[PDB]
Amino acid sequence: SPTKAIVRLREHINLLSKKQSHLRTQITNQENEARIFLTKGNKVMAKNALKKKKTIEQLLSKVEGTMESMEQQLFSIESANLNLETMRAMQEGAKAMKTIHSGLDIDKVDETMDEIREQVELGDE
């Protein structure tokens, strides 16, 4: 069902937002480790901590892209559903209009209408 897909997409996005928060924390942690290494005079290990920070930032970007893709999919589904709702309302409205336009069991107005239409249109060819 559309509802099923929608709730699952939201659940997935929620989890990815938690992964986002976790990765941001890990990025700050790498910065922290780098500063401490520099205060120790170990530029090699500071650089190594910042290389890892860069890798984590790359993964954070991929998490963000995954979330965006799911949000777009969710929007598409919600939009399609509203379109279906409009379509069903229009078809039931059209049914009601047909019933009203055949509302006369008395007497032969529709056929006369069509006859006069064609007379009026006869000037066109």
UniProtKB/Swiss-Prot annotation:
Consequence of substituting L84E: Leads to severe sorting defects
One function term, GO molecular function aspect: identical protein binding
Entire-sequence positions represented here: 18 to 142 of 240
Outcome (variant: M87E): Leads to severe sorting defects
Result, substituting R8E: Leads to severe sorting defects
Keywords: Cytoplasm, Endosome, Isopeptide bond, Membrane, Nucleus, Phosphoprotein, Protein transport, Transport, Ubl conjugation
Protein name (Swiss-Prot/TrEMBL): Vacuolar-sorting protein SNF7
Subunit structure: Core component of the ESCRT-III complex (endosomal sorting required for transport complex III). ESCRT-III appears to be sequentially assembled as a flat lattice on the endosome membrane and forms a transient 450 kDa complex that contains DID4, oligomerized SNF7, VPS20 and VPS24. SNF7 polymerizes into spirals at the surface of lipid bilayers. SNF7 polymerization is nucleated by association of SNF7 with VPS20; the process is terminated through association of VPS24, possibly by capping the SNF7 filament. Interacts with VTA1; the interaction requires DID2. Interacts with BRO1.
Domain notes: The N-terminus (residues 1 to 11) forms an amphipathic helix which is required for the association to membrane.
GO process annotations (BP): ATP export; intralumenal vesicle formation; late endosome to vacuole transport; late endosome to vacuole transport via multivesicular body sorting pathway; peroxisome organization; protein transport; reticulophagy; ubiquitin-dependent protein catabolic process via the multivesicular body sorting pathway
Consequence of substituting H12E: Leads to severe sorting defects
Regions that span the bilayer: none
Keyword Manganese: no
UniProt modified residues of type Phosphothreonine: T55
